[PDB]
Design a protein around this motif. Structure first.
Motif, PDB file in Angstrom:
ATOM      1  N   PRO A  37      19.152  26.673  27.285  1.00 53.04           N
ATOM      2  CA  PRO A  37      19.073  28.064  27.772  1.00 53.04           C
ATOM      3  C   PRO A  37      20.370  28.858  27.554  1.00 53.04           C
ATOM      4  N   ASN A  38      21.509  28.180  27.394  1.00 57.15           N
ATOM      5  CA  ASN A  38      22.737  28.912  27.316  1.00 57.15           C
ATOM      6  C   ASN A  38      23.072  29.350  25.904  1.00 57.15           C
ATOM      7  N   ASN A  39      22.128  29.117  25.000  1.00 52.52           N
ATOM      8  CA  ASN A  39      22.357  29.354  23.592  1.00 52.52           C
ATOM      9  C   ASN A  39      22.668  30.831  23.330  1.00 52.52           C
ATOM     10  N   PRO A  40      23.718  31.109  22.534  1.00 52.03           N
ATOM     11  CA  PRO A  40      24.183  32.494  22.422  1.00 52.03           C
ATOM     12  C   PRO A  40      23.233  33.367  21.598  1.00 52.03           C
ATOM     13  N   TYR A  41      22.583  32.784  20.589  1.00 50.57           N
ATOM     14  CA  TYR A  41      21.669  33.529  19.714  1.00 50.57           C
ATOM     15  C   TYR A  41      20.295  33.796  20.355  1.00 50.57           C
ATOM     16  N   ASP A  42      19.915  33.015  21.377  1.00 52.06           N
ATOM     17  CA  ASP A  42      18.516  33.014  21.908  1.00 52.06           C
ATOM     18  C   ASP A  42      18.405  32.271  23.233  1.00 52.06           C
ATOM     19  N   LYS A  43      18.036  32.953  24.306  1.00 50.25           N
ATOM     20  CA  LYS A  43      17.885  32.260  25.594  1.00 50.25           C
ATOM     21  C   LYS A  43      16.719  31.246  25.636  1.00 50.25           C
ATOM     22  N   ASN A  44      15.770  31.400  24.731  1.00 49.11           N
ATOM     23  CA  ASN A  44      14.629  30.523  24.649  1.00 49.11           C
ATOM     24  C   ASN A  44      14.847  29.289  23.776  1.00 49.11           C
ATOM     25  N   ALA A  45      16.061  29.121  23.298  1.00 50.39           N
ATOM     26  CA  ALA A  45      16.348  28.067  22.343  1.00 50.39           C
ATOM     27  C   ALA A  45      15.812  26.704  22.757  1.00 50.39           C
ATOM     28  N   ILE A  46      15.354  25.958  21.752  1.00 45.69           N
ATOM     29  CA  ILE A  46      14.919  24.575  21.967  1.00 45.69           C
ATOM     30  C   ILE A  46      15.449  23.716  20.824  1.00 45.69           C
ATOM     31  N   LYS A  47      16.353  22.811  21.171  1.00 44.96           N
ATOM     32  CA  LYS A  47      16.988  21.871  20.235  1.00 44.96           C
ATOM     33  C   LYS A  47      15.981  20.781  19.944  1.00 44.96           C
ATOM     34  N   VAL A  48      16.120  20.138  18.787  1.00 44.87           N
ATOM     35  CA  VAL A  48      15.227  19.052  18.467  1.00 44.87           C
ATOM     36  C   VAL A  48      16.155  17.911  18.190  1.00 44.87           C
ATOM     37  N   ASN A  49      16.060  16.877  19.036  1.00 40.81           N
ATOM     38  CA  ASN A  49      16.853  15.632  18.877  1.00 40.81           C
ATOM     39  C   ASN A  49      16.041  14.445  18.380  1.00 40.81           C
ATOM     40  N   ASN A  50      16.685  13.561  17.616  1.00 44.66           N
ATOM     41  CA  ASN A  50      16.032  12.290  17.266  1.00 44.66           C
ATOM     42  C   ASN A  50      15.958  11.385  18.500  1.00 44.66           C
ATOM     43  N   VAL A  51      15.133  10.330  18.467  1.00 47.35           N
ATOM     44  CA  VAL A  51      15.086   9.335  19.609  1.00 47.35           C
ATOM     45  C   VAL A  51      16.441   8.882  20.212  1.00 47.35           C
ATOM     46  N   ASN A  52      17.511   8.820  19.397  1.00 45.62           N
ATOM     47  CA  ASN A  52      18.846   8.447  19.875  1.00 45.62           C
ATOM     48  C   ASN A  52      19.592   9.592  20.531  1.00 45.62           C
ATOM     49  N   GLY A  53      19.045  10.794  20.422  1.00 42.28           N
ATOM     50  CA  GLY A  53      19.621  11.928  21.101  1.00 42.28           C
ATOM     51  C   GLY A  53      20.598  12.709  20.251  1.00 42.28           C
ATOM     52  N   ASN A  54      20.705  12.398  18.961  1.00 43.20           N
ATOM     53  CA  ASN A  54      21.441  13.288  18.062  1.00 43.20           C
ATOM     54  C   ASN A  54      20.635  14.504  17.612  1.00 43.20           C
ATOM     55  N   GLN A  55      21.232  15.674  17.724  1.00 38.51           N
ATOM     56  CA  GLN A  55      20.590  16.874  17.267  1.00 38.51           C
ATOM     57  C   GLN A  55      20.220  16.801  15.773  1.00 38.51           C
ATOM     58  N   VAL A  56      18.968  17.201  15.536  1.00 40.28           N
ATOM     59  CA  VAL A  56      18.391  17.273  14.217  1.00 40.28           C
ATOM     60  C   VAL A  56      18.327  18.748  13.788  1.00 40.28           C
ATOM     61  N   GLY A  57      18.093  19.634  14.750  1.00 41.25           N
ATOM     62  CA  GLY A  57      17.852  21.030  14.400  1.00 41.25           C
ATOM     63  C   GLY A  57      17.323  21.805  15.590  1.00 41.25           C
ATOM     64  N   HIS A  58      16.576  22.877  15.306  1.00 42.50           N
ATOM     65  CA  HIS A  58      16.065  23.786  16.358  1.00 42.50           C
ATOM     66  C   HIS A  58      14.603  24.130  16.071  1.00 42.50           C
ATOM     67  N   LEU A  59      13.858  24.580  17.075  1.00 44.78           N
ATOM     68  CA  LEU A  59      12.541  25.189  16.809  1.00 44.78           C
ATOM     69  C   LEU A  59      12.755  26.615  16.338  1.00 44.78           C
ATOM     70  N   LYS A  60      11.803  27.177  15.578  1.00 44.38           N
ATOM     71  CA  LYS A  60      11.945  28.570  15.117  1.00 44.38           C
ATOM     72  C   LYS A  60      11.835  29.426  16.355  1.00 44.38           C
ATOM     73  N   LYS A  61      12.507  30.575  16.353  1.00 48.73           N
ATOM     74  CA  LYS A  61      12.536  31.455  17.517  1.00 48.73           C
ATOM     75  C   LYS A  61      11.156  31.889  18.032  1.00 48.73           C
ATOM     76  N   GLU A  62      10.147  31.986  17.177  1.00 42.40           N
ATOM     77  CA  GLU A  62       8.850  32.410  17.682  1.00 42.40           C
ATOM     78  C   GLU A  62       8.215  31.293  18.573  1.00 42.40           C
ATOM     79  N   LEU A  63       8.318  30.062  18.087  1.00 47.11           N
ATOM     80  CA  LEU A  63       7.747  28.912  18.758  1.00 47.11           C
ATOM     81  C   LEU A  63       8.568  28.696  20.015  1.00 47.11           C
ATOM     82  N   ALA A  64       9.872  28.892  19.913  1.00 51.40           N
ATOM     83  CA  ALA A  64      10.731  28.684  21.056  1.00 51.40           C
ATOM     84  C   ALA A  64      10.392  29.698  22.168  1.00 51.40           C
ATOM     85  N   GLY A  65      10.097  30.934  21.798  1.00 53.58           N
ATOM     86  CA  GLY A  65       9.694  31.955  22.763  1.00 53.58           C
ATOM     87  C   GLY A  65       8.375  31.538  23.381  1.00 53.58           C
TER      88      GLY A  65
END
Length: 121
Positions: A37-65
Motif C-alpha cells: 500500500p505504501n507504493n509511491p506510484y500506486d496505492k493499490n500496488a500488488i507485488k508478486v513474489n516467488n514461493v521463497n519470497g523474492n520479488q518477481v514483479g508487480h500486477l498491472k495497475k488495472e488488475l491491482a485496482g
C-alpha cells in the motif's frame, strides 16, 4: 474461512516489471500476491513474489485496482500460479483462483466488475 470456502472462480493476468527483479519462478509454480500500500506510484500496488519470497514483479495497475480492495478486506483468498513462460523477460502469464465464503461472492464480483473484470470457470 470457518464453515469452509467456495470457489468464486478464476482470472488470468500478467506479472509485469520483470526486468527490475531477479526472483526466479519455474513453470507451474505458485507465486504469492503481496499488497504494497505504501507504493509511491500506486496505492493499490500488488507485488508478486516467488514461493521463497523474492520479488518477481508487480500486477498491472488495472488488475491491482481491481484486487486491492479484495485483498485489503479479506473478501477472498487468491491463489496464483505461473502456468507457462516463467522464463519470459518482460511479462509472465499468471493464473488466479478466488476462494472465500458464499456470503462474499457478490461483494467480490461487484468489486471486479466495477474495475472491468469478471471471474470465469
Amino acid at each position: 474461512f470457518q464453515g469452509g470456502s467456495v470457489l468464486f472462480g478464476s482470472l488470468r493476468g500478467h506479472v509485469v516489471g520483470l526486468r527490475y527483479y531477479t526472483g526466479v519462478v519455474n513453470n507451474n509454480e505458485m507465486v504469492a500476491l503481496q499488497r504494497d500500500p505504501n507504493n509511491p506510484y500506486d496505492k493499490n500496488a500488488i507485488k508478486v513474489n516467488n514461493v521463497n519470497g523474492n520479488q518477481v514483479g508487480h500486477l498491472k495497475k488495472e488488475l491491482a485496482g481491481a484486487l486491492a480492495y479484495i485483498m485489503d478486506n479479506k473478501l477472498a483468498q487468491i491463489e496464483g500460479v505461473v502456468p507457462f513462460g516463467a522464463n519470459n523477460a518482460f511479462t509472465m502469464p499468471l493464473h488466479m483462483t478466488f476462494w472465500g465464503k458464499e456470503e462474499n461472492r457478490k461483494a467480490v464480483s461487484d468489486q471486479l466488475k466495477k474495475h472491468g473484470f469478471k471471474l470465469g470457470p
